[PDB]
UniProtKB/Swiss-Prot annotation:
Species assigned in the record: Thermotoga maritima (strain ATCC 43589 / DSM 3109 / JCM 10099 / NBRC 100826 / MSB8)
An annotated Gene Ontology molecular function: isomerase activity
E.C. designation(s): 5.1.3.-, 5.3.1.-
Positions contributing to Mn(2+) binding: 149, 182, 208, 243
Keyword set, alphabetical order: Carbohydrate metabolism, Isomerase, Manganese, Metal-binding
Subunit details: Homodimer.
Identification of the protein by name: 5-keto-L-gluconate epimerase
Cofactor note text: Binds 1 divalent metal cation per subunit. Mn(2+) is the most efficient metal cofactor, but can also use other divalent metal cations such as Ni(2+), Mg(2+), and, to a lesser extent, Co(2+) and Zn(2+), but not Ca(2+), Cu(2+), and Fe(2+).
Cofactor(s) for this UniProt protein: Mn(2+); Mg(2+); Ni(2+)
Record-stated family: Belongs to the hyi family.
């Protein structure tokens, strides 16, 4: 297993210099603390100079392991299940742009809130629309790999558990789509987290960690020990990525606390 840090970046349209500064600050922090990769989240990649990002990654020897897309929903209203087919098409087109960036870095593309909500419809219809959008994304991309992140009930009513996602993966039937499990969301939605991760098995492609309060791992009451025993049992050997509030004590202190907690769990496997 490898350790990665999610870094928050200002949106480049709403402040170009701030995006670049946030990115460099966070990557330098990740490197200093000892993380092996970073993870980012961008709303619209069209407005970022990714050649410059690649140079920074090369300078610091820090790959970008995953790219989040949720701001395309929260800020721009784009959803892969939107009842308006015009918006569904625009959401597919936006995510294609994320895959173009991801291909420069070998990064996973995260399907979180960009999948959209039920919006008063049946789960069945929402799921069918989503599967159609994912199949279109697979037809549109030759190399992109996607991970579906189950999210808690307050963020969405569509895909709340690992099982919800596994059912969808069986219908999509592509090894280019897997699961991103997140301990903060699982702490609410999963009955037995070790059992849920065993069911995921080889389909677990990426992993987000934060404590029960979404603070740095170690600063709540989530049982990471049982989780890491299960990750070893299933042979998980990809990224464990810290996605936590900058607490306690700010972004640097949280990243350091998280790293120390996770390193001790990993080294004792
Ligand atoms: Mn997450």
């Amino acid at each position: 297993m490898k350790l990665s840090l999610v870094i928050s970046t200002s949106d480049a349209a709403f402040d170009a210099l701030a995006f670049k500064g946030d990115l460099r600050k966070g990557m330098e922090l990740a490197k200093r603390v000892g993380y092996q990769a970073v993870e980012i989240a961008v709303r619209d990649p069209s407005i970022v100079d990714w050649n410059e990002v690649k140079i920074l990654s090369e300078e610091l020897n820090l790959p970008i392991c995953a790219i989040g897309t949720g701001q395309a929903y929260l800020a721009d209203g784009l959803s892969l299940t939107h009842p308006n087919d015009e918006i569904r098409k625009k959401a597919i087109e936006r995510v294609v742009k994320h895959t173009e960036v991801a291909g420069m870095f070998g990064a996973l593309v995260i399907i979180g809130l960009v999948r959209g909500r039920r919006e008063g419809r049946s789960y069945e219809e929402t799921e069918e629309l989503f599967i159609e959008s994912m199949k279109r994304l697979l037809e549109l991309t030759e190399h992109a790999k996607f991970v579906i992140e189950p999210l808690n009930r307050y963020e969405t009513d569509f895909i709340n558990t690992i099982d919800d996602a596994l059912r969808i993966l069986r219908k999509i039937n592509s090894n280019r789509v897997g699961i991103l499990a997140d301990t903060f969301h699982m702490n609410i939605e999963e009955v037995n987290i070790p059992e849920s991760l065993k069911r995921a098995g080889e389909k677990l492609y990426h992993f987000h960690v934060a404590d029960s309060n979404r603070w740095a791992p170690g600063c709540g009451h989530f049982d990471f020990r049982s989780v890491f025993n299960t990750l070893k049992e299933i042979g998980y050997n990809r990224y464990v990525s810290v996605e936590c509030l900058p607490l306690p004590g700010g972004m640097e202190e949280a990243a350091e606390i998280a790293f120390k907690t996770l390193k001790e769990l990993i080294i004792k496997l």
